[PDB]
Short mmCIF file of N, CA, C and O in Angstrom, two decimals:
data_model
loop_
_atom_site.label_atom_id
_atom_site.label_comp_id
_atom_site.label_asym_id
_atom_site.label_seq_id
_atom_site.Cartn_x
_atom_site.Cartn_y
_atom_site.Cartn_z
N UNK A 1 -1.84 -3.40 12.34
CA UNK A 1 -0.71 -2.76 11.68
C UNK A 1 -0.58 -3.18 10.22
O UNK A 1 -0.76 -4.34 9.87
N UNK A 2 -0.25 -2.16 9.34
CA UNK A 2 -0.07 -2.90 7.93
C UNK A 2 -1.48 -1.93 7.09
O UNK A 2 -2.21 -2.39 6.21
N UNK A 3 -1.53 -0.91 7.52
CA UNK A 3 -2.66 -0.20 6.69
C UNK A 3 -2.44 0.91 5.76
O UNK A 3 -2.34 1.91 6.46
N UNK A 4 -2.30 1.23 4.50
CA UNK A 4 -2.01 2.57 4.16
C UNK A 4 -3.31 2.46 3.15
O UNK A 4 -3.96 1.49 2.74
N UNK A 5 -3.45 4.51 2.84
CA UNK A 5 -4.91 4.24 2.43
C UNK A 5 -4.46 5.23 0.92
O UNK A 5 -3.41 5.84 1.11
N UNK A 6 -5.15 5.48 -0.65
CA UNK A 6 -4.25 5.30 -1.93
C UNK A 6 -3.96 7.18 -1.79
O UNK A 6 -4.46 8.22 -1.35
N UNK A 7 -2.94 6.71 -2.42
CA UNK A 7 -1.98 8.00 -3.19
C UNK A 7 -0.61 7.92 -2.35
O UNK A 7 0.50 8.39 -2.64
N UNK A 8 -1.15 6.95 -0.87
CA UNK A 8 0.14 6.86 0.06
C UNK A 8 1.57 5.89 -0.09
O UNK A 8 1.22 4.82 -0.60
N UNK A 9 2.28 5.89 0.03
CA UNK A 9 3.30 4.78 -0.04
C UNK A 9 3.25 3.81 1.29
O UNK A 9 3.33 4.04 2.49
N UNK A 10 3.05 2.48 0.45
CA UNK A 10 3.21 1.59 1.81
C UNK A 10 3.93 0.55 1.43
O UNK A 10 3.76 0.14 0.29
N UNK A 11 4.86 -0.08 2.27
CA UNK A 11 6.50 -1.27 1.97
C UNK A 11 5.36 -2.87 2.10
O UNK A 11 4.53 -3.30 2.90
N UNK A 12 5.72 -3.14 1.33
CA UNK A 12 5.27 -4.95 1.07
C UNK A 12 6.24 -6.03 1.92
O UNK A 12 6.52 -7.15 1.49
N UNK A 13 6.67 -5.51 3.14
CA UNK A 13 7.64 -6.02 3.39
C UNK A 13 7.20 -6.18 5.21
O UNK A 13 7.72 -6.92 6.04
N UNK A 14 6.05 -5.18 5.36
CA UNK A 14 5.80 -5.26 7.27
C UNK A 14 4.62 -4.42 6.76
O UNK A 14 3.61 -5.04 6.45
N UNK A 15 4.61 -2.84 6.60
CA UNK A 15 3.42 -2.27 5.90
C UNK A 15 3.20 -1.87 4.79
O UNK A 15 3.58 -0.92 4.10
N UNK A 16 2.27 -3.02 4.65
CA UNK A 16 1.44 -3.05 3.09
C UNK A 16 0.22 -1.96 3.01
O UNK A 16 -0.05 -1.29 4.02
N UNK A 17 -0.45 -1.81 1.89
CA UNK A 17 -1.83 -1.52 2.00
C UNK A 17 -2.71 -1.93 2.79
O UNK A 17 -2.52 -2.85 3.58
N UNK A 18 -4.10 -1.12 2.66
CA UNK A 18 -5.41 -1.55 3.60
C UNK A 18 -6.02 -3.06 2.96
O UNK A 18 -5.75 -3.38 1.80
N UNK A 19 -6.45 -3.49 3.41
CA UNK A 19 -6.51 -5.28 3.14
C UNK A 19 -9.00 -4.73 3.21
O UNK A 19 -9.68 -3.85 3.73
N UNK A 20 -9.25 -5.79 2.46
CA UNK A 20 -10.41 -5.59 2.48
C UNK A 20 -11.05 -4.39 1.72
O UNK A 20 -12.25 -4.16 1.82
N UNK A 21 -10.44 -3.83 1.16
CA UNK A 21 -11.30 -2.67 0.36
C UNK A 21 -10.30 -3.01 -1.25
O UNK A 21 -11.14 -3.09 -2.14
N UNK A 22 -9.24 -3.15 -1.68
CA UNK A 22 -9.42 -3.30 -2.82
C UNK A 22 -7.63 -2.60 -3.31
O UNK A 22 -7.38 -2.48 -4.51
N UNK A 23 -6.78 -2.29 -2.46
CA UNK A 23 -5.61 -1.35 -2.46
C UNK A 23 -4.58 -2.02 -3.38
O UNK A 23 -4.93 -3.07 -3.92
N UNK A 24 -3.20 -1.49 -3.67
CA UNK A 24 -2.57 -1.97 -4.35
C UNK A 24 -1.08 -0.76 -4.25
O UNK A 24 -1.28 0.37 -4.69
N UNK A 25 0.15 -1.05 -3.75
CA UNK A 25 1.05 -0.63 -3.40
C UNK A 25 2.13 -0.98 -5.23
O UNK A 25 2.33 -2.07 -5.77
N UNK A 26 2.57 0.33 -5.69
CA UNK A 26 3.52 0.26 -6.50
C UNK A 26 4.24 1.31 -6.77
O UNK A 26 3.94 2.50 -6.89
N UNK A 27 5.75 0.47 -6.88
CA UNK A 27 5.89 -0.54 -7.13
C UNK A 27 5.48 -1.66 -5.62
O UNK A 27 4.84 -2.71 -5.52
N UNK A 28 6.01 -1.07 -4.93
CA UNK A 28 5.85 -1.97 -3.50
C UNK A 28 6.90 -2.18 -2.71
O UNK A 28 6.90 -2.14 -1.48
N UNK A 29 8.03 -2.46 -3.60
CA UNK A 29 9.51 -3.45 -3.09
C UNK A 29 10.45 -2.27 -3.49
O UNK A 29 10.75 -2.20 -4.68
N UNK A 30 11.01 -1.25 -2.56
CA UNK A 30 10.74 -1.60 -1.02
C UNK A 30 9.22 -1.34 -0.48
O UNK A 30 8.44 -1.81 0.36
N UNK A 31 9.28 -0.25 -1.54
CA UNK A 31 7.44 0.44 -1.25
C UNK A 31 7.30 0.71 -2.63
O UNK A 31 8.09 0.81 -3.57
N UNK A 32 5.41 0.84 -2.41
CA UNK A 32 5.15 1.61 -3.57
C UNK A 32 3.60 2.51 -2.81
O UNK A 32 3.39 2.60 -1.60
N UNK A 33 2.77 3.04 -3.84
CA UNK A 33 2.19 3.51 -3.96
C UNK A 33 0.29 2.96 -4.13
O UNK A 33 -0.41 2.72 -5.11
N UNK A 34 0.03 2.94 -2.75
CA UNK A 34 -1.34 2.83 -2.66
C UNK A 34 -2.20 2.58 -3.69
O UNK A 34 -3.22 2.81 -3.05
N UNK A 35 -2.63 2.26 -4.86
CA UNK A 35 -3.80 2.10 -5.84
C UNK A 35 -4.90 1.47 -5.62
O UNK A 35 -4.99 0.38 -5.05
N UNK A 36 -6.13 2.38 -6.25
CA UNK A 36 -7.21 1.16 -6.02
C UNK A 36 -7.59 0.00 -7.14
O UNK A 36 -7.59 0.08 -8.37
N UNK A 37 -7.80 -0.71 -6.58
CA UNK A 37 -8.12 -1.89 -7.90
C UNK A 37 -9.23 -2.37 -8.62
O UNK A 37 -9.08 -3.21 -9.50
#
Protein backbone atom coordinates (compact mmCIF):
# COMPACT_ATOMS: atom_id res chain seq x y z
CA UNK A 1 0.00 0.00 0.00
CA UNK A 2 1.40 3.50 -0.53
CA UNK A 3 1.82 3.48 -4.45
CA UNK A 4 0.79 6.24 -6.85
CA UNK A 5 2.29 6.38 -10.31
CA UNK A 6 3.18 10.54 -11.90
CA UNK A 7 0.61 13.05 -12.95
CA UNK A 8 -1.44 11.27 -9.95
CA UNK A 9 -2.01 12.78 -6.53
CA UNK A 10 -0.74 10.84 -3.65
CA UNK A 11 -1.01 12.12 0.50
CA UNK A 12 2.52 11.89 2.33
CA UNK A 13 0.69 11.03 5.17
CA UNK A 14 -0.41 6.86 4.55
CA UNK A 15 -0.25 7.10 0.51
CA UNK A 16 2.75 8.38 -0.83
CA UNK A 17 4.28 7.76 -4.22
CA UNK A 18 5.78 4.54 -5.88
CA UNK A 19 9.08 3.99 -3.83
CA UNK A 20 11.98 2.50 -6.07
CA UNK A 21 11.62 4.14 -9.40
CA UNK A 22 12.30 7.74 -8.67
CA UNK A 23 8.53 9.61 -7.79
CA UNK A 24 7.91 12.73 -6.04
CA UNK A 25 4.38 13.93 -4.66
CA UNK A 26 3.68 17.94 -4.71
CA UNK A 27 3.03 19.62 -2.87
CA UNK A 28 2.32 16.36 -0.82
CA UNK A 29 0.83 17.76 2.58
CA UNK A 30 -2.07 16.83 2.46
CA UNK A 31 -1.23 15.52 -1.11
CA UNK A 32 0.48 16.43 -3.97
CA UNK A 33 1.26 15.41 -7.27
CA UNK A 34 3.29 12.41 -8.50
CA UNK A 35 6.72 13.76 -10.26
CA UNK A 36 9.52 12.05 -11.61
CA UNK A 37 12.89 12.88 -10.34
Amino acid sequence: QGCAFEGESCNVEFYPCCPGLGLTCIPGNPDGTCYYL
